[PDB]
Symmetry: C3
Subunit: 114 residues, 3 copies
């Protein structure tokens, strides 16, 4: 699984340990081994949410399976909770795009996951 | 809706007011309230288009609905127009990926839009 | 085609000529004319792969057609080879999301490709 967060929160406001915490919690939530989880945080962005530039986040989760109505609600609770607690971003100023990928459509290690 | 523009135009060449203009113009175009529009501009990027490093932009629009043949043509004219007028990017050096998202695949406020 | 690479490798470790090499080799691999190939490289990123901050890359390839199981394997071999040779990233620390786009969902030059 691949989780990306783009935010206007400054770099110095991203606490030490954040990438590891995302990795750990997404392994737990998706049920995939942590070795297969990738995370990426992009602070200091020029962005607005609903016309204002208070803290906000635009995110994505790509996964080979483990995407669906109830799963995605659970991911969103987890991820908005982390963004609120660690980055002080209100949950109502977070969007997360969920993308269910076919194995043949994910490249890795000179091939695909097919 | 979520609109992202990645460009090699320098930060100083992005006008004050550009995020607000994008927000207003996208609210009008999608028919959705401004409160639901998120915009993100990423200048100073290392990019090329057709092998050239003249000004260019790589963009995306995600929306729950309001995506389709005619609508996307209209969005492309609007958005290329804004990129030309405000960032001085030629329309033939812009790509916009349109993604129609299901409500269950968009996280927001500790849940999804389903 | 649009190819994006996000990496924790520093900017100074991205060799001169890399965007041009990507452009040329993607044109060949995809069959598409070079004028339609867009490339974007984003160094210095705060990312982890498998919980580790060793060099890694998170990438995407969008194309109107030319996406499929054998093609994607071929792209992955090409692109992981380039990331290994030029950026010193292990192929087993690269993910590439492949997205086959409908022509009507790609904006360019004030319109779409439909
Ligand atoms: Cl996304
Ligand atoms: Cl996109
Ligand atoms: Cl992607
Ligand atoms: Zn997306
Ligand atoms: Zn896309
Ligand atoms: Zn994607």
């Amino acid at each position: 699984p691949m989780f990306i967060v783009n935010t206007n929160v400054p770099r110095a406001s991203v606490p030490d340990g954040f990438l590891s915490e995302l990795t750990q919690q997404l392994a737990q939530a998706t049920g995939k081994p942590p070795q297969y989880i990738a995370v990426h945080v992009v602070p200091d962005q020029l962005m607005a949410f609903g016309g204002s530039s208070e803290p906000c986040a635009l995110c994505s989760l790509h996964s080979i399976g483990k995407i669906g109505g109830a799963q995605n609600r659970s991911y969103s609770k987890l991820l908005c909770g982390l963004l609120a607690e660690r980055l002080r971003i209100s949950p109502d100023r977070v969007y997360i795009n969920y993308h269910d990928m076919n194995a043949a459509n994910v490249g890795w290690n000179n091939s695909t996951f097919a």
